[PDB]
Design a protein around this ligand. Structure first.
Ligand code: PEE
Ligand code: NDP
Ligand code: ZMP
Ligand code: SF4
Lengths: 51, 97, 337, 112, 85, 174, 114, 51, 156, 318
């Protein structure tokens, strides 16, 4: 808050963002279907990632 | 000899000349060889069907086996040559024909 | 209205252009250059909404306005002119439909358009006719279009009249056609070589030229005619066609009558025939080289050479073996002139 | 005061020349792979022009920062990141012409 | 072949004659490539990269900092070819 | 008569004309498919049906598939069709004229002068009475392989086995 | 005959469906519409070399089993031979080797499939 | 008795002729979505997959 | 047995055909993906209307554009639209992409979905209730049913 | 008039694949609680023809990158063989009395997938090539065990002729004798036909409609159609081969009335499989086969080789 009625900056942590960052470490060398399942275990939602 | 046999034999002669005209990537040669194999098979079986020389009914299939067998081997070598190049006959290391 | 703001998709302009039969190759481009200006348009459909649908993006919310109409009813054409500041005629047809007899299309419709353009006090009227519209025994289109040309000139004399010197584009019914003559086998030449000669103009150039013509105060009753910078020989031309389409090239020399036997053979199809005897006469007659008439450069626009632009036009005809290739590889065709 | 990359000018100019080499040589591959129908020369010229666009920058660190922002683009075209649209974007080809002549502008619009 | 120095010079000036900024009148071997020729500084890089595109080896750009005269670069081509005759 | 077996032999031979010419292995695989079905048909005409269906199964249902794998490993961009080169297409025509000369020789009805004599006329003529009880000659003829011909079974078993071993000792080396 | 007739009617049927499939909708093909699908964005390159040893390393084993089953086929008829003890060993024998072959692959880690 | 045309050719390696090994450069690279149902409508997971 | 009569019959036949089992593909980009799914949820079941979500445009026709569009995304959208077979349609959905909607003023949105593709029916909402969507597509069928290329083709 | 018999074999079956599609969406619907297609019917019944008309009416583009010849010839072969496999099938009376038509069923089934290989090869797309390739993997990998277990269940009927397979089931049914092989036959038919848990050729979410993608209107209808041809056909095949029935020659029709039940009872089950299990992934798909199915297929095979001798129960046919 700047004190005004319009908030000055509102960075929004998105839990999915970190996960998806960690994905490629988590998914090296795995079969291509398994990377598809593993995207899903990350249960990510891109609307939250892109904020 | 009836004309049909002559025709199959000629299919053999083409199935050889094709192997020896021999060009570019060699996978074509394993094909042409297998075609050759097939012509020998058919030419055998027609005969064993002809004279009712019954025991020899076993041969063509056995023929087929080993013949197919060597071809089955052949691909493996191609793999290796494919492994270092992306195959072509045009590239050979060895010297002196 | 007085124009406002930077020219742009949101920009207003006074133009409330009315384009007829825009469903075709021209003037989809002409509407687009109106649309980048943001100028309003009232393109009216005869056909079906569906084919018209891709026209929609070109506008900006309220801009483009389809209107139902018929060229035959008088008031039906009174409809779409009814508030138009300018009215433009791009209507043309190569193969004579039944119900639209080949004459009225080039006569009656431009006529009603012209006189209604009078009554509605339309600020400008404009109309198209092929350069060879000058009367000639072959082909009824040059003549019928000459008749409506002279008619609208007799009815709306201050109208400028387009005389385009063959436009080449991706959506062309011409270059694609000779590109597609491969499908039969050879390419029917009446006698090869200099039997006939043609010059071409980029479609984009024609469009820019038309709207520039509305941008030109001087372009009043003058009969504008459009020609590309280069000059080519039909034989070497088709040679360049299969030089860019990479398809095998077979010249197919032919006694002149038989080709017309062919056109009569192919007019039979109920649908839209690939060829017609009218088109057969579109074939072998060369364009006249007269430059003295008001024309494209007089507008200040310079023609884009065909030589760099045929490639995009014909890549779809390419076999997969050759589907990716630089145009420069093909070699610029020699210019006869 | 911490420099980004090269100390003083010229050391950074060589960087940019290297960059021109990379872009220039890459361009025909760009026209080939992307099926761009721009004249093969034109891309090169346009590259040279874009290189002329900042041909008066004179700060220390700012120029190396400029080659940082210059790497990423060839970085993208080489990885087929961006596309025909995205790389054709530089030519501004759909724009209506805008003469800089005072009177010309003067007739057209209210202007600044 | 032995690659004579004349082949090198002939090729250098050949590529520089094929190039546009260097008009044939502008051409002069001993003359300093920038001090006389009016061509833009990028042209150094363009023609050098083309010439080395012919001789085939990458020019490290310290050698782009050579220049002085085109002939000194020819001398460097002799230095790499090690023919120097 | 129909000469149907013989015309099948002709399609067979052109199957090798388009096959022995060498225009990307995949199309050649088509060549052996056509020649394959034609083959099983031809041997079927004498009624050795089990064998024709061996080749129509074991060969074409086996081989040309694994070749449909090699091309995945070989391919190279822009594989050539038969029409895609003057030597390939020239070769195909080169086969066609020859085999057609053979058919013209069949029109001549004279015994073939090539290599060695081909007696001519229709195929049927060589047939003899196929009289038998409720069993085809082929059936017990191949059934004999086990009981009455153990030796071949031994060497084939051994051979195929050690062939698997060879495949190992080639691929594992990498 | 019989079978050739049904082959011809089937193939002609299918070919008929093809011809009524193409020469019917009668609409506008054009470039980019005809460009290959690639989940939106254009392909980075035409299909090349999805190489894998793990293809042939097993697929070849397929081929050498299929040759084996080719020898298994005579069995139902061979079962009625006059002298089964002469046969029976072999009837088992090949199967053992079939299994044996597999077994050899099973544990030289040559069977990584995938 | 070499010919000069043969003389240009190098003597055979004393073992493995290793240099050619540098030559293999096989790779593939490919993209999921956005359309792709597993890509949740808005992901472009480009990846350099092997076989 | 007038030719026009038969044309009316075939018109009815193909337009009824296409309208009776259209096969959407879906850019459920943003958050209106989920409401799309509730159309396909058992309680409303799009399938009983015959419509069935099948991926890969080449096997599909009508296109739903659920959810907010963005700049980087747009070219892919135009690609997919181009690769569809005729007679392709689309459907803008929500306040999403009717015209940016909530995000009308940002550098990355591309205002309407209209500015890259020629939209058919609009289905306003934010999210539209899946049922309002259902009314949407039924309205789409009541627009296909008025299609009549055959009547017009004969007329021309 | 043999020709009208053939036509009488080909029309009804195509009708059957259409209504098979509709049943698929129906049952597979009610597993999901949601009703299947309904509104256009009244009971949905009119749907499939509206569907097919929607397809064939729709434009089928010839892809710019694709070679055209293979691209067209593949679907043709698909419907071709999909129909041709039907001919020697005893219902009760085979349209053709092949001496060894079972082996022929294997022949057709084995040339089937080759069409898939072309379907993905000429399609030129990345997804096309990868999906087609893995497809051919799973397929062949299952045809080997396929044909072996079919052999072992055929040692005891007597011979490869099909009609005799009725005669050998005049009482107990084959299934009680060798059900485990019936299991493996079932699953091998569940994968060879490329179905529910063994789902890979279509790929679906894994590979957006797999090999089949680039095909547009009609050819797609052909692969789709042919696929269902194989599903109902292997189902019927299993039915006659593992489930016998009473057969009075004087009233053949009675038998058929029974037979379509016994086969339909199978086809529905695939759908009721489809509603139940997630797909395997290409590793495990081949893992369970080479590692686990196969050795049992062999042990069972020697066992079935050996029963007729120990039991002195050798089947009649010469
Ligand atoms: C792309 C184009 C797609 C076209 C697809 C065409 C694919 C067709 C290939 C199928 C070939 C297999 C035919 C084998 C038929 C067969 O085995 O019949 C069994 C039957 C068993 O009889 P028995 O019981 O043993 O004897 C007493 C019985 N009364 O055999 C016979 O008796 C009939 C013999 C007649 C021979 C007919 C053979 C026909 C072969 C045609 C092959 C042509 C291939 C060309 C394909 C072109 C594709 C590009
Ligand atoms: N290269 C060229 O093509 C050149 C063309 N011209 C002239 O310029 C004009 C523009 O050419 P182009 O646009 O390519 O031709 P098109 O056929 O593409 O455009 C004509 C359009 O007008 C419609 N139309 C016209 N009259 C009627 C009618 N009575 N009923 C229904 N529809 C009608 C047509 O059918 P609908 O709208 O119903 O679909 C079509 O959409 C043409 O008239 C041509 O003679 C001149 C020089 C060169
Ligand atoms: C194909 C079309 C698509 C690509 C179009 C071109 C892509 C290029 C992207 C632009 C990247 C840049 O321009 S980065 C900064 C470039 N540096 C400068 O402009 C520096 C200007 N300062 C100067 O002194 C310049 O005159 C020179 C040329 C560097 C002088 O050289 P010095 O003698 O070493
Ligand atoms: S509609 Fe509501 S939900 Fe869908 S995008 Fe616009 S705002 Fe987000």
């Amino acid at each position: 808050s700047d004190g005004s009625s319009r908030p000055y900056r509102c960075k929004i942590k998105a839990p999915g963002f970190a996960h998806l960052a960690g994905l490629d470490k988590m998914s090296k060398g795995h079969m291509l279907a398994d990377v598809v399942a593993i995207i899903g275990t990350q249960d990510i939602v891109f609307g939250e990632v892109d904020r | 000899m009836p004309l049909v046999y002559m025709n199959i034999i000629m299919a053999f002669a083409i199935a050889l000349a094709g192997l020896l005209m021999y060009r570019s990537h060699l996978m074509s040669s394993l094909l042409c060889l297998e075609g050759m194999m097939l012509s020998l098979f058919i030419m055998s079986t027609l005969i064993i069907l002809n004279t009712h020389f019954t025991l020899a009914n076993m041969m063509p299939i056995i023929l087929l086996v080993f013949a197919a067998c060597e071809a089955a081997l052949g691909l493996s070598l191609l793999v290796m040559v494919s492994n270092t190049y992306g195959t072509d006959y045009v590239q050979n290391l060895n010297l002196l024909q | 209205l007085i124009p406002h703001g930077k020219g742009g998709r949101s920009s207003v302009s006074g133009i409330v252009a009315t384009v007829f039969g825009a469903t075709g190759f021209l003037g989809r481009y002409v509407v687009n250059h109106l649309g980048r200006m943001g100028s309003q348009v009232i393109v009216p459909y005869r056909c079906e909404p569906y084919d018209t649908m891709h026209l929609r993006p070109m506008g900006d919310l309220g801009q483009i306005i389809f209107m139902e109409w018929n060229g035959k009813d008088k008031d039906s054409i009174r409809k779409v002119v009814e508030h138009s500041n300018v009215v433009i005629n791009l209507v043309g047809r190569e193969w004579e439909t039944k119900n639209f007899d080949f004459e009225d299309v080039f006569v009656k419709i431009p006529h009603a358009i012209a006189q209604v353009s009078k009554e509605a006090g339309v600020e400008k009227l404009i109309h198209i006719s092929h350069l060879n519209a000058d009367i000639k025994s072959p082909s009824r289109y040059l003549r019928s279009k000459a008749v409506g040309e002279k008619e609208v000139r007799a009815a709306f004399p201050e109208a400028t009249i387009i005389k385009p010197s063959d436009i080449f584009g991706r959506e062309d019914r011409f270059l694609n056609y000779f590109a597609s003559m491969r499908w039969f086998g050879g390419v029917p030449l009446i006698s090869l070589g200099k039997e006939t000669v043609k010059q071409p103009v980029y479609i984009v150039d024609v469009s820019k030229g038309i709207i520039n013509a509305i941008k030109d105060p001087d372009a009043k009753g003058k009969t504008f005619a459009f020609v590309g910078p280069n000059r080519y020989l039909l034989f070497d031309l088709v040679q360049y066609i299969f030089a860019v389409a990479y398809r095998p090239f077979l010249p197919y020399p032919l006694p002149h009558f038989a080709y017309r036997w062919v056109g009569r053979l192919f007019e039979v199809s109920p649908f839209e025939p690939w060829t017609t005897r009218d088109k057969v006469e579109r074939v072998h007659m060369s364009d006249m080289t007269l430059p003295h008439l008001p024309g494209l450069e007089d507008l200040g626009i310079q023609a884009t050479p065909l030589e760099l632009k045929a490639i995009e036009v014909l890549r779809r005809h390419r076999t997969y073996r050759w589907l990716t290739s630089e145009m420069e590889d093909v070699k610029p065709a020699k210019t006869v002139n | 005061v911490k420099p980004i990359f090269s100390r003083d000018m010229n050391e950074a100019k060589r960087r940019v020349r290297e960059l021109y080499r990379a872009w220039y040589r890459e361009v025909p591959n760009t026209v080939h792979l992307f099926q761009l129908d721009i004249s093969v020369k034109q891309g090169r010229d346009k590259v040279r022009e874009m290189f002329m666009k900042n041909a008066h920058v004179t700060d220390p660190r700012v120029v190396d920062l400029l080659v940082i922002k210059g790497k990423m683009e060839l970085e993208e075209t080489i990885n087929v990141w961006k596309q025909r649209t995205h790389i054709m974007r530089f030519f501004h080809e759909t724009e209506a012409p805008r003469p800089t002549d005072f009177l010309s502008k003067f007739y057209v619009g209210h202007d600044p | 072949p032995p690659l004579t120095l004349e082949a090198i010079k002939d090729r250098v000036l050949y590529v520089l004659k094929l190039y546009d900024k260097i008009d044939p009148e502008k051409l002069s071997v001993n003359s300093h490539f920038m001090k006389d020729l009016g061509l833009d500084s990028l042209d150094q890089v363009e023609i050098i990269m083309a010439m080395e595109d012919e001789f085939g080896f990458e020019i490290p750009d310290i050698d782009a900092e050579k220049l002085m005269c085109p002939q000194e670069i020819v001398d460097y081509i002799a230095d790499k070819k090690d023919v120097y005759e | 008569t129909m000469y149907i077996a013989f015309i099948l032999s002709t399609i067979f031979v052109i199957g090798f004309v388009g096959f022995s010419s060498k225009p990307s292995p995949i199309y050649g695989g088509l060549g052996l498919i056509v020649s394959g079905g034609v083959g099983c048909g031809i041997v079927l005409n004498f009624g050795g049906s089990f064998l024709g269906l061996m080749v129509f199964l074991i060969y074409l249902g086996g081989m040309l598939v694994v070749f449909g794998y090699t091309t995945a490993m070989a391919t190279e961009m822009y594989p050539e069709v038969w029409v895609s080169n003057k030597t390939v297409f020239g070769a195909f025509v080169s086969g066609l004229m020859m085999e057609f000369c053979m058919v013209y020789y069949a029109l001549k009805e004279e015994e073939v002068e090539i290599i060695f004599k081909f007696n001519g006329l229709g195929d049927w003529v060589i047939y003899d009475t196929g009289d038998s009880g409720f069993f085809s000659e082929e059936a017990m003829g191949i059934a004999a392989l086990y009981s009455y011909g153990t030796w071949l079974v031994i060497v084939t078993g051994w051979s195929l086995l050690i062939g698997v071993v060879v495949i190992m000792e080639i691929t594992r080396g990498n | 005959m019989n079978i050739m007739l049904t082959l011809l009617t089937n193939v002609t049927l299918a070919s008929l469906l093809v011809l009524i499939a193409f020469w019917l909708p009668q609409l506008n093909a054009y470039s980019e519409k005809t460009s290959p699908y690639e989940c939106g964005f254009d392909p980075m390159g035409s299909a090349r070399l999805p190489f894998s040893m793990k293809f042939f390393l097993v697929a070849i084993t397929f081929l050498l089993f299929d040759l084996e089953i080719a020898l298994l086929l005579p069995l139902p008829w061979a079962s009625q031979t006059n002298n089964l003890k002469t046969m029976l060993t072999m009837a088992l024998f090949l199967l053992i080797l079939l299994a044996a072959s597999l077994a050899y692959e099973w544990t030289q880690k040559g069977l990584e499939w995938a | 008795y070499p010919t000069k045309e043969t003389a240009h050719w190098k003597p055979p390696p004393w073992n493995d002729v290793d240099p050619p090994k540098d030559t293999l450069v096989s790779n593939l690279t490919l993209n999921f979505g956005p359309q792709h149902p597993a890509a949740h409508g808005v992901l472009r997971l480009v990846m350099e997959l092997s076989g | 047995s007038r030719g026009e009569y038969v044309v009316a019959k075939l018109d009815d036949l193909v337009n009824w055909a296409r309208r009776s089992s259209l096969w959407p593909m879906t850019f459920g980009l943003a958050c209106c993906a989920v409401e799309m799914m509730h159309m396909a949820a058992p309680r409303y079941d799009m399938d009983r209307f015959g419509v069935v979500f099948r991926a890969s445009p080449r096997q599909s026709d009508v296109m739903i554009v659920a959810g907010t569009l963005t700049n980087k995304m747009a070219p892919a959208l135009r690609k997919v639209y181009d690769q569809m077979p005729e007679p392709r349609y689309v459907v803008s959905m929500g306040s999403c992409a009717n015209g940016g909607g909530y995000y009308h003023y940002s550098y990355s949105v591309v205002r309407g979905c209209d500015r890259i593709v020629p939209v058919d029916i609009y289905v306003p909402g934010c999210p539209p209730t899946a049922e309002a969507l259902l009314y949407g597509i039924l309205q789409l069928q009541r627009k296909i049913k008025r299609e009549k290329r055959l009547r017009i083709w004969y007329r021309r | 008039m043999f020709m009208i018999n053939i036509l009488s074999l080909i029309i009804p079956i195509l009708l059957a694949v259409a209504f098979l599609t509709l049943v698929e969406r129906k049952v597979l619907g009610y597993m999901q609680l949601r009703k299947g297609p309904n509104v256009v019917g009244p009971y949905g019944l009119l749907q499939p023809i509206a569907d097919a008309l929607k397809l064939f009416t729709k434009e089928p583009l010839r892809p710019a990158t694709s070679s055209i010849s293979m691209f067209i010839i593949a679907p043709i072969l698909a419907l071709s063989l999909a129909l041709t496999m039907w001919v020697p099938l005893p219902m009760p009376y085979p349209l053709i009395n092949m001496n060894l038509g079972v082996l022929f069923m294997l022949a057709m089934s084995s040339l089937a997938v080759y069409s898939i290989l072309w379907s993905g090869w000429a399609s030129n797309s990345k997804y096309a090539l990868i999906g087609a390739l893995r497809a051919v993997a799973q397929t062949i990998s299952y045809e080997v065990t396929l044909a072996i277990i079919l052999l072992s269940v055929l040692l005891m009927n007597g011979s490869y002729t099909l009609s005799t397979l009725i005669t050998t089931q005049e009482h107990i049914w084959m299934i009680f004798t060798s059900w485990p092989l019936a299991m493996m036959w079932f699953i091998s038919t569940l994968a060879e036909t490329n179905r529910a848990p063994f789902d890979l050729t279509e790929g679906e979410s894994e590979l957006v409609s797999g090999f089949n993608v680039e095909y547009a209107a009609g050819p797609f209808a052909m692969f789709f159609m042919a696929e269902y041809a194989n599903i109902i056909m292997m189902n019927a095949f299993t039915a006659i081969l593992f489930l016998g029935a009473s057969h009075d020659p004087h009233t053949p029709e009675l038998y058929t009335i029974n037979f379509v039940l016994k086969t339909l009872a199978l086809t529905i089950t695939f759908l009721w499989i489809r509603a139940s299990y997630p797909r395997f992934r290409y590793d495990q798909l081949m893992h369970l086969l080479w590692k686990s199915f196969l050795p049992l297929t062999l042990a069972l095979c020697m066992w079935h080789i050996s029963l007729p001798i120990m039991t002195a129960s050798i089947p009649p046919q010469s």
